[PDB]
Amino acid sequence: HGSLARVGKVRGQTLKVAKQEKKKKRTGRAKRRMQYNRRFVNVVPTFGKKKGPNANS
Amino acid sequence: KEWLPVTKLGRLVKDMKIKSLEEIYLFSLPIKESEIIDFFLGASLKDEVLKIMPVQKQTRAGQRTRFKAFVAIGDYNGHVGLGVKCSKEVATAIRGAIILAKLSIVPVRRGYWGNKIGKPHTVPCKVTGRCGSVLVRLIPAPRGTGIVSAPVPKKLLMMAGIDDCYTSARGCTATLGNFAKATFDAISKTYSYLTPDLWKETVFTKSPYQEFTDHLVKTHT
Amino acid sequence: RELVFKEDGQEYAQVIKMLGNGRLEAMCFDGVKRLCHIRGKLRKKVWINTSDIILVGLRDYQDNKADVILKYNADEARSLKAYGELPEHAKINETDTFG
Amino acid sequence: MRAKWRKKRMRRLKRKRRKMRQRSK
Amino acid sequence: GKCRGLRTARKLRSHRRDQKWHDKQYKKAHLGTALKANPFGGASHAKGIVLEKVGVEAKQPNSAIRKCVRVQLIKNGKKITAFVPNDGCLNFIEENDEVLVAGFGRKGHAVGDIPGVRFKVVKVANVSLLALYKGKKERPR
RNA sequence: CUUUAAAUCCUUUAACGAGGAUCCAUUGGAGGGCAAGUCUGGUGCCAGCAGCCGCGGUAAUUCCAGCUCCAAUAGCGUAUA
RNA sequence: CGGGAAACCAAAGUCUUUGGGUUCCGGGGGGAGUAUGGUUGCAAAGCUGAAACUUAAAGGAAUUUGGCGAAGGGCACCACC
Numbered sequence: 001h002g003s004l005a006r007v008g009k010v011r012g013q014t015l016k017v018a019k020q021e022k023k024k025k026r027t028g029r030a031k032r033r034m035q036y037n038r039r040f041v042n043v044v045p046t047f048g049k050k051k052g053p054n055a056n057s
Numbered sequence: 058k059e060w061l062p063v064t065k066l067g068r069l070v071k072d073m074k075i076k077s078l079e080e081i082y083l084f085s086l087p088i089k090e091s092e093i094i095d096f097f098l099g100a101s102l103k104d105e106v107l108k109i110m111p112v113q114k115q116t117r118a119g120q121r122t123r124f125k126a127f128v129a130i131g132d133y134n135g136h137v138g139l140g141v142k143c144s145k146e147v148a149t150a151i152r153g154a155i156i157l158a159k160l161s162i163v164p165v166r167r168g169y170w171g172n173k174i175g176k177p178h179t180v181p182c183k184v185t186g187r188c189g190s191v192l193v194r195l196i197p198a199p200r201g202t203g204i205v206s207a208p209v210p211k212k213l214l215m216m217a218g219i220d221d222c223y224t225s226a227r228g229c230t231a232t233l234g235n236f237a238k239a240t241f242d243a244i245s246k247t248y249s250y251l252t253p254d255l256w257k258e259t260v261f262t263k264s265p266y267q268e269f270t271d272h273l274v275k276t277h278t
Numbered sequence: 279r280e281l282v283f284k285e286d287g288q289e290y291a292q293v294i295k296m297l298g299n300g301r302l303e304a305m306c307f308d309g310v311k312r313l314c315h316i317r318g319k320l321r322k323k324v325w326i327n328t329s330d331i332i333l334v335g336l337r338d339y340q341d342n343k344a345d346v347i348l349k350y351n352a353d354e355a356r357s358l359k360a361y362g363e364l365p366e367h368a369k370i371n372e373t374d375t376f377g
Numbered sequence: 378m379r380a381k382w383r384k385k386r387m388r389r390l391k392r393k394r395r396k397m398r399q400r401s402k
Numbered sequence: 403g404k405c406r407g408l409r410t411a412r413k414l415r416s417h418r419r420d421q422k423w424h425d426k427q428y429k430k431a432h433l434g435t436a437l438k439a440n441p442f443g444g445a446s447h448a449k450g451i452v453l454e455k456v457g458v459e460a461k462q463p464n465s466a467i468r469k470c471v472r473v474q475l476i477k478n479g480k481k482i483t484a485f486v487p488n489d490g491c492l493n494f495i496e497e498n499d500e501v502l503v504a505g506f507g508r509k510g511h512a513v514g515d516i517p518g519v520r521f522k523v524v525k526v527a528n529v530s531l532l533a534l535y536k537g538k539k540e541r542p543r
Numbered sequence: 544c545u546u547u548a549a550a551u552c553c554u555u556u557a558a559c560g561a562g563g564a565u566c567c568a569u570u571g572g573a574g575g576g577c578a579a580g581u582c583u584g585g586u587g588c589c590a591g592c593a594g595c596c597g598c599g600g601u602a603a604u605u606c607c608a609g610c611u612c613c614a615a616u617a618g619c620g621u622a623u624a
Numbered sequence: 625c626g627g628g629a630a631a632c633c634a635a636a637g638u639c640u641u642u643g644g645g646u647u648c649c650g651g652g653g654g655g656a657g658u659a660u661g662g663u664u665g666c667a668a669a670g671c672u673g674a675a676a677c678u679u680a681a682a683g684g685a686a687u688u689u690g691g692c693g694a695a696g697g698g699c700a701c702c703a704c705c
Contacts, residue, residue: 001589003589004589004590005589006589006590007590008590008591009586009589009590009591010585010586010587010589010590010591010606010607011590011591011607011608012590012607013585013586013590013607014584014585014586014607014608015584015585015608016608017584017608017609018609019609020609020610022610023563024563024565024567025568027568027569027616028568028616052579052580052612053579053580053611053612053613054573054579054580054582054611054612054613055580056580056581056582056611056612057580057581057582
């Protein structure tokens with residue numbers, strides 16, 4: 001606890017999780033090429049409702 | 058999955074002695090079977106759900122809620138419809154709204170902007186629909202303009218086959234039911250406008266009932 | 279149930295006059311009159327009466343406003359007075375729930 | 378309060394204010 | 403339109419002039435009282451010196467302690483209160499220090515559940531709060 | 544080499560000049576308006592988010608961090624007329 | 625007939641198919657018919673009439689469970705005589 005007026009407590013007592021070494025994302029023209037391929041090339045005919053691009057069910 | 062037509066119009070349609078629904082629209086006959094249209098308009102008749110607005114009626118204990126579903130249907134080179142149904146759950150509300158939308162589809166005519174070359178693309182006149190407080194006005198546009206409007210009359214106008222139009226709405230258009238019924242009234246009032254393009258005195262042909270009544274009395278009671 | 283104590287910035291106080299608009303002034307045990315505040319967990323669940331022992335939080339940048347944490351009942355206030363966290367001259371005046 | 382007696386109260390307050398200003402010469 | 407005549411233009415112009423004067427948003431920008439009563443003086447940002455760190459409280463539905471600061475201006479000496487925007491930035495501000503003060507974004511009105519505030523702090527001691535939050539700049543001493 | 548008062552800048556042109564081509568693309572946001580996780584940990588009407596509705600009460604799709612995704616792109620966010 | 629958000633209206637109709645003539649008057653709620661100035665009156669008071677500040681609502685029409693120390697009909701020894 002400490003006090004009700006402790007400033008910045010939740011920023012200061014949360015756990016520190018380090019970053020992850022990830023691959024360089026290509027930016028510019030080929031990113032639009034990847035977006036076009038993933039949207040309008042690899043589409044499969046489904047039924048009902050299409051899940052979102054971040055649908056982590 | 059079998060059609061048993063209750064009206065004589067459905068039996069005349071099913072026995073394949075009528076040509077199109079255009080004569081049905083010419084004689085202004087009431088249509089009370091939803092899938093006569095499904096017999097006529099095939100895979101070109103597509104529907105999209107507009108809004109599902111939940112309503113509530115308070116009771117002895119708590120509020121009894123119900124869902125009202127709006128859907129618009131129509132082929133992309135002609136007729137267009139709109140149907141409303143409210144029921145307990147969502148699926149039967151959508152099914153009933155689709156049935157009522159197929160039941161009431163109206164024809165459209167399209168005009169030209171200045172030069173009459175090729176196929177028509179725009180509204181022939183300055184039609185106006187009115188329901189509630191929503192005031193929807195449709196104005197002809199030159200070729201290649203596109204439907205510039207709110208999204209709901211935009212999708213209704215691409216569904217209705219009109220390619221180029223100028224719109225100007227007024228009132229509380231946030232209510233989607235009044236907005237959709239007002240633009241449907243604006244579209245449906247297109248044939249109900251006398252222009253000098255059709256001032257010639259019409260010819261009255263025979264009704265389907267009096268010309269196929271021999272078939273009706275030979276088939277049914 | 280438990281006996282929570284003070285901390286390095288948390289002290290004790292006694293209510294002097296009940297105040298409106300969800301606030302009160304309480305007499306701290308340092309000679310300083312402090313305008314306290316009712317905690318949002320105490321706005322309807324439990325009530326604070328005049329002349330009761332409560333736990334109060336403080337600000338490290340000003341001493342004009344404060345905030346109440348919890349409230350002590352009669353037996354635990356007497357037990358904490360017997361231990362020595364409270365001064366002996368502080369009159370608890372037998373705050374209790376009547377019948 | 379209703380508007381009539383509020384207007385009467387504000388009339389009385391205005392009369393007291395006018396008297397105080399005219400006696401504060 | 404009511405007065406619809408061929409040589410009726412000064413009547414229409416004068417009537418629309420008085421009815422345009424009889425407004426709120428247009429009248430606020432065409433009278434000097436609103437600009438003089440504004441502590442910014444028609445300016446977008448302003449500077450000031452911190453006097454003390456205060457704590458104000460939220461309204462009826464939500465309950466928290468929104469932490470602000472009392473700043474007196476440079477240009478005129480009016481005394482305002484300003485809300486420190488982000489989490490834990492009250493350590494970055496000490497008394498008698500220069501701050502750059504901007505509005506919330508509702509044109510001199512209170513925003514959210516904080517009563518009586520119209521200003522917020524962007525920079526302190528001529529360095530931004532975002533760089534201090536993200537560990538990108540340090541406070542000089 | 545060219546330019547120019549003389550340079551510098553651009554263009555031409557020798558020699559060197561990249562593989563995880565570390566020669567590393569940021570700014571906002573992910574409940575609705577409004578494009579995009581009912582993911583995983585920490586606090587528990589406190590800290591804070593939130594232009595507006597509203598979100599936090601010891602299972603937070605809105606806080607604080609990690610992964611993924613979304614909008615524009617050498618640009619993006621905020622305040623005032 | 626027609627109009628309107630509806631209650632309703634033969635005018636509150638002939639209005640996105642928007643223009644017969646003409647006067648007064650309102651731009652979310654509070655502050656506030658308030659302060660000051662002028663003016664009128666013996667007086668009480670009348671006419672003209674702000675701003676600072678504060679708020680996301682204040683409002684209009686209508687339908688079912690809400691309660692009436694509202695009315696009209698029926699029922700109960702967990703009501704009464």
